[model samples]
Target: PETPNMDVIGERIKRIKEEHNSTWHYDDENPYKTWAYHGSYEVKATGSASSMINGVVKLLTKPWDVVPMVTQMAMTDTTPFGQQRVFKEKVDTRTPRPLPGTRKVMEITAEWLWRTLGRNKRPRLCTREEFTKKVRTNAAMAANQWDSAKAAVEDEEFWKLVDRERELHKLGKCGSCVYNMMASRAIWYMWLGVRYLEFEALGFLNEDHWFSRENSYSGVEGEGLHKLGYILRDISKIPGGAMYADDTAGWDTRITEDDLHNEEKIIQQMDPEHRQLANAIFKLTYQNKVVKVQRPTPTGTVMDIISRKDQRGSGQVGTYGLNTFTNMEAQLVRQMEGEGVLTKADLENPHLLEKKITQWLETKGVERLKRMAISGDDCVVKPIDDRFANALLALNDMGKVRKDIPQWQPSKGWHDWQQVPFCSHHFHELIMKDGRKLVVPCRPQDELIGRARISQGAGWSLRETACLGKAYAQMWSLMYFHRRDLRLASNAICSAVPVHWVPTSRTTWSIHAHHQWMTTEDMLTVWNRVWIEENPWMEDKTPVTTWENVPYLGKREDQWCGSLIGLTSRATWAQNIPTAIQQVRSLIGNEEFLDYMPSMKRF
Candidate 1:
């Protein structure tokens, strides 16, 4: 036989594909297809259902893509079904790392806050459109080359850059290292300010606040720049992005009184258009100086340092709880070094310093406890009845003995109360390693207890306090029971992840159920229904039939706490669950435990 002509055979195959119109089709206009391999599938026409059957046959060729829809429908599409329809689809649950753009945004935000905001200088604030235009030129350049550069880039590298920023001033003292001092001050202040704003503003903002709009990358709504640090930390752990040289300039160092006084001289030196721009910029920068509050006295002698009034706009009362702990930690470290519990070199070792602090707490906590009790003249229990007197007295003895409690000072005024030692009877009540004040019963009730203890001492309502103590105990037990089950979901788990009882459209979970039906009329109708039920006699506020009338409905995605709040929220709630459950038990009575009990899983 003649040797096979490979070239001839290839030409014949190509000619056959062209004749049959089975050649791969591609278009220059649709570059999205470039990511996918092009192919053609052939099918034969058969009978009446040929097109539909042929399409099914094509799908069936990809066995992985085919599902047993008929069998599933048989099981699901039954009479007497629930009100809502249910559909099942395979979902991706793997943790999604932040994309490069998100990581870059977070890094830039952190850098801006650290280098600019911390220095008492405000970054050049512009409208979102202006800021975006400025960054978009560079971003667009990066996007064009992203395909070529992305594979080699590592996400953690950006974090290293952030670490460098943080470590920059670590070696110097507060005054010498303005960067370190200001950064620390910024974190604390921002955290406090965010919490304060949440209350003062009463809710998240729809637009950037006039003050924050220019300075923040994420605008002034919701967490804004306040949560940049959180985003930076979280993104570093997950994945994506690389450290590019930050081209953005820090703001002009804070404009001062001397600079303002010499403004006319500076203006006279400038060119005509330059002078106009300089004067406008000066006015804006000078206005910031007026809006920024003066730093409170170090000892916090007055409550009105950040507020105009003594009692109103009083942000979270326990805002400084962590700050006080940190202060006491620093003080303890100094004392330990003096006493030889730690060496001068040991201060460099955070682990060693923390170990020494722990040791100090364990040894000295009881003595401190007794001192606290002795000073707490008003510390009284409810009508110390005969049966529970020993239990109550034992609780009183244990209340003050806490190794982790922060130093409390009554003289420091309002914010100082947040730093007071937790009640001993509530064992799981101390502030955790994290800054959040995990409260027993509920957050509002915890504030009540905090204010009562700080203002009125032990003489405050013992029954109410004891009730909180019981609530915390119950809350603890409930958490204990739920801890293992909690692995199925968590706060850190992105809401996009599939989890049980998660509000899906197919389910009757209220928010998701009505998501598609959400018209302004529907929202208003629902709001009115609930409002009228709750307030029968009150006249309704002029109901506006616009989407803007209920902006919260639009903000549900960010406002909902279904995701990673589970991890920390659960931990904190578990600690206080025992007390919460006990309070419920008292109210429901011992005659009924399970029957009258509050839902265990709900907490």
Candidate 2:
């Protein structure tokens, strides 16, 4: 069993993916890293703009990494470690956890943005050729090597040397720990600014807007420097620092000890399962609510707070969605401490909530996932050996339906596709045209709805479901006035047919035959044969051509509700039925439902 609200979070992720084109997420790339620390550090840009960024990065790095201070013992004159402070002591490091600004990696991205847009004092776009030359050198420093003493500054083993300092901070005892504050401030600043920069500029640059380009992680590999702290510290020492670090430093920076260590900490503190739970709560309650993320950033964007990472872009999920403003473990602790969905007692005793949530997701023996994609649209009556006319009424009344949605009524002669009953009421209507009635249904009208329908509509076609067909509409019609209207709307079903018919108590049912041949020409010829016995001035009112027969409509997979649109040829019908029946059966939860239809027997 997973944490409480895990399913909810998964669904929310699915929704976000739909809206945002399924962006990839990694623990290292999560936005909550900035909030993990707080303190003073530097985000040095070549120009004063870099100074501004430096100031912000320093304040945001307190929760995790910190800079190590070299101290000289007066008696021994030896350089040893000094007191460290948690970065948060210096400033407010809080930022929305899930947005572009929420992660340590993002800070570096912000620096990239500033560099790309000329935020650095000497702002200039470094072409791919030039950037490549620079990145190789920067990579050496950002990804410090254990064997090489010169590259050990940003190394994990080097940072692990001060693990005791971190534990002390956790105990609330290390107020002036240099390593604590330094690592926190430096990394948070780097990641926060970077995330903001990338999300705002690069995200918008991709599919969201006109300026967006088609390719991502391509071109502009280098150019930004002085944005990603500590790593830049060593890079700036190299000749032409800008020429030494490629713009895409983060790509290689992903697997570094700094990143791995931070991820380990995050995973340790905010267990993946627990984080997923928090995410679920946030999604169910506050998705679509605006949130700001932070990452590394260049100096060129519109921002000036030194301690505050610059805001590069903004996005929201649900109206009450959650943000990565706080570490999930801390948040869970906070919830346990205060009023929240899960209680301190339950959190302390995890088994209760875990079991409860798992059972709910597995309710009714259904996985609660979107139904398997498949549906159909042909009149099918079953479970009866009688030919009673009233039987058709009962048959049509079958299926569970949401009464609020429009019901299908095929009463009016099938002249147009509009006669179909689709899930949307506003779309299904009868309009008079040139003395004859016309039926029209609504199209999804936009990509969002269309895509939803496309992905889920195969099995989820609203109008074609048995639930809608026999159950929901029928049940609701008996309970509410609104539902009654829905029931009445479908009364038009099976009302019109060119053939004449009558039903009597004794005779039961019988057809009154009439020869309404092909065209007026044939009728005129017949009238001429009997002209001597009838009025000569009377005009022929009957049709005499093959045009009298209605044409069959073609198949359409795009319109999920368009299975039985009645094509002009059997070839088209055969082509569509295989898919139509397959999809329809998927909806009915019985694939053979169509095969049993009295009408389909002719096929």
Candidate 3:
């Protein structure tokens, strides 16, 4: 067969159009569709088919010619050879270029984006409602478990178990164990109306809103309908006048009696509800207000107190008190007595007790004594001692008093109650440190559920669709319609592999069986080479890394990257059809070739 001249082919198309009343009478877009048009046009132009007898004779005599002329036209008039006209237009021109100024413009835009989105911003305070809910949840749970926790404080069985448990559950160096021993007793007090007594005893109550300036400073705004009510509840008591007048008192001498009277007058004049706030503001101004107590040394520093600049000034004191002492202190005292630091008789002497204790303290150094003396009294020691003895006996019963578990015994070392033990309780009504209590749940679980409903269906699916659409558009842009080879390749792939053909095990196995040219062995070879070449960093020996790049592994490689390769290879083979047919005939012998080849088959 010879190729037709473009001039002659163009003339033939013009003639065919004239016969069809100037219409092309063919789909110009799809080659397959155009083939149908060519068949119809030939039938219309060449007139009706011949009689069955004549048709049979012609088909048998020249089987190759008997096949439709359109078949030959399709092979020569499309694809690799026919695509010359498609590329005859200008090679490149008028393509949009990035403007010369775009580099700086993009850079500036990126910087602006980073400033707006990347920088760390100040933390926003949680809304009062959110805060309330969080506090209430902990408080409720703490309150609910109060009894059990309290019982554990006294129950020997409980401490014994804790001892045994602690050995197994070592804190390591980074951990701190807050056993029910401490938490339970605190919770029991919280359940009682006098829990505030424990707090006051610990000196947690000493700090006015400003540690002296305000009466109370605990309540946050927006928690209750009764605004004034919430305000008064957080008020701290005004220190008595006697302390300020006393030369050895804890009151700051810089704050005169007149100044105090003026502050009180300002609060009394304010609206009853606003009085709490006014007092809080006043307290804030005197945050460093001090109180003085007796000390043996001229001045001293303690573990907590920052030393004063003037060594002669009244020694700085901290807020720690007796109620805050832990079982650790009782344990320490017992160990000391056993070691003969002080005989049981010396401990029992009430009048000489302080003198003995103070002498013992000097040996430990002034810093240690300072910690113990702040609001210290011997009475508080007894309760702590009792609790420690109770716990020790309980642990002994449980057989868990192992030397492996090092206990932290509290000392007379007074320290402010830095944290609330029953802070994790829930309350229908509960007094806060500043004296505020919950009237109701700030935000309930049911309310949270209702709020969540608004976000239904506004998530993953929408994000996925958006991402998928963006990728699809990107792929379409890569087709570059002006590039004939690329467009043609894409079209061939799209037609050959329908989107409906998912790469399941059945479909994948069927493809290998259906396509005789490529076998499972060939696919496996390609699969293995891809892994070894692409994943050199893989660590496993004899690793099963073969399917890493393939979609869903070797069974499903016929999609995207894999599919493109298969389509291009098959197209390359199809382009040499004439040689392929000749080679098949030579290899299979004439009989088989004649029986299978459409051109060789006879009627």
Question: Could you report the Cα RMSD, in angstroms, for every candidate shown?
Answer: 31.9, 32.5, 42.9
Report the alpha-carbon TM-score of model 3 versus the true structure.
Answer: 0.15
Model 2 off-target regions past 4 Å?
A: 1-44, 47-150, 153-164, 173-357, 362-603
Please tell me which model should have the higher TM-score, number 1 or number 2: 1
Q: Candidate 3 residues 1-603, lDDT tens each? A: 112223212332343345445323333432221011121122211111111111111111121232343123222222222222221221101122222222222222223222322133211212223323433432211111333433433445544443332332221110111111000353332222112111211112122111111111111211211122222222112211100000111122222222222223323333543444334222321221211111111232101001010101111111121111211122233323433444434433334334444344335322221112111111111112222322332122111222333433322221211110111111122222333222211112122112111211212332222222222211221211112222232222222222222221111111002221122122324333322233232233232322122122121222321222244454553343344444423432333212222211210
**Alpha carbon lDDT of each predicted model:** 0.23, 0.22, 0.23
lDDT of 1: 0.23
The digit string of per-residue lDDT tens for model 2 on 1-603 reads 111233323332343334334332332422233332111112222211111111111111121112122011011211111101122222223221222211222222222322322221221112223323333442211111112332333445534433433343233232111111122344333232222222221222122211111111111112111111111122223321011010111121112222222222211223443333223222222221112222233332111111122111112111000011111111112112222222324333323443333333234111111110000111111101112111112111111111232333212212222332221211222212222221122232221111111111122333322222222212211111111112221111111101112111110010111111212122224322322123222244233222112111122422343221243442353434344434434433422231311222323
Q: In candidate 1, what are the lDDT values of residues 440-464, reduced to their tens digit? A: 2112222222221121112123333
